[PDB]
C-alpha cells in the first residue's frame, strides 16, 4: 500500500525547475554568479527597443514565446484589443487604451500563458506598442 505514497512522492511532482536528465554539473552551473554559462541565464520575451508598426484592424495577429509565462507588461501609445486564446475558440478579450498604460498582469497568481493575440481596437489612429514578459 505504501507504493501509492511512493508514486505520490514529490520529487516527481511540483518541482519548480522541470527535471529532464539534469546533470549535477548543469544544476551547479545554473546557480553561479561568475560568468554566463548556458544555464546561468534566464529566458523571457520582448520586442524592443522599437515598438511595432501594426496595421491590422480585424484579424487577430499572434505572438508566441518559448515558454509558459507568469507575468506580462505592456507599454502602448493609444489603443488596442488584447487577448489570450482567441478567436476560433470562445475565448475572451480585453480592451486597453491610453491613460491605462503601462499595463501589467500576473502576480505570482497562476497565469500559464504562451500565446497572445492582438488587434487594433478601433477609436484610435494607427497606434500600436510594446509587449514584455517575465516568467
Amino acid at each position: 500500500e505504501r507504493l501509492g505514497r511512493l508514486v505520490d512522492v514529490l520529487e516527481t511532482k511540483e518541482f519548480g525547475d522541470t527535471t529532464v536528465e539534469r546533470s549535477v554539473t548543469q544544476n551547479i552551473d545554473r546557480t553561479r554568479t561568475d560568468s554566463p554559462n548556458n544555464e546561468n541565464q534566464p529566458i523571457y520575451f520582448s520586442t524592443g527597443p522599437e515598438a511595432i508598426a501594426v496595421e491590422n484592424t480585424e484579424e487577430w495577429e499572434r505572438l508566441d514565446f518559448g515558454i509558459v509565462a507568469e507575468t506580462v507588461n505592456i507599454r502602448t501609445t493609444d489603443d488596442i484589443d488584447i487577448a489570450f486564446a482567441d478567436p476560433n475558440k470562445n475565448g475572451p478579450v480585453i480592451r486597453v487604451r491610453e491613460g491605462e498604460s503601462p499595463f501589467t498582469i500576473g502576480g505570482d497568481a497562476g497565469i500559464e500563458s504562451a500565446f497572445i493575440w492582438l488587434r487594433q481596437a478601433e477609436t484610435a489612429s494607427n497606434t500600436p506598442g510594446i509587449q514584455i514578459i517575465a516568467f
Binding site: E59, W60, E61, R62, P87, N88, K89
Partner: protein
Amino acid sequence: YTISHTGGTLGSSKVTTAANQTSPQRETAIIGFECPRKFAEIEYVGQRDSTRFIPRTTESITGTAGDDTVVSLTANIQPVAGETAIEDQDYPVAVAYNVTQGVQVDIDAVDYAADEVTLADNPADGDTVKVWPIMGDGDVQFRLVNQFGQEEGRVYPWATPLYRWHDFPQLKRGREINLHGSVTWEENETVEVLLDAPQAITWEDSDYPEGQYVSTFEQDVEITL
C-alpha cells in the same frame, strides 16, 4: 469538432474576390475564396455539402416603337424549378431596367425555346435599356491556388452543366445541388471558381433594381472552428 458554415459572395471576410471572365471563350477565374487567419482549415466534400449558383449576365439595347419583346437573349433560359410562371418561381429569371427613365420593367411573358421575353412597357427612342438574365449553359470547375499564387490542382474536374443550379427546388431537402470530389484548404491559401460559357457575367451593376448584387455563388461547407 466541426460545424457547418456558408461561404458566399461576401461571407466570412473581404479578402474574398469577385471578378469576371473574357468574351473569348477561354476558361478563366471567376471567384476567389481565400481563407483567413481566423480559421484553421476548411473542408468541402461534394456529394455531402450543398452548393448554389445564380449566374446572370448583361445585355444592352435601345428602345423604340414596337420594342415590347426582348430579342434572343444569348442565354439558355429554363423553367425555374420546372414551372414557367414568373410569380410561382422560387426566384425570378431575368429583369430589365430603362435607365433614362430610371424604372424597372416587370415582365409579362417568356419564350423558353427561343430564349426571349416580352414585357409590359414600350420604352422610347434614343433610350437605353439593360437586361440581366440568368446565364444558361456553361462549364465550370474548382481550382486550388496556394498562397504563392500558383496552382496545386482541381477538385474532380468534371464540368457541371451551368443550368443545373436552377433545376431543382434549391432549398428543399433532398433536392439540393451538390458536386463531386472533396478538398481541404489551408490558412492563407485560396480556392478559385473557374468558368467558360458563351458570354460575360456581371456583378454590382448599379442600375439593377433587385439587390446590390445581381448574382451569387454560395456553398455550404464544413469548418474547423
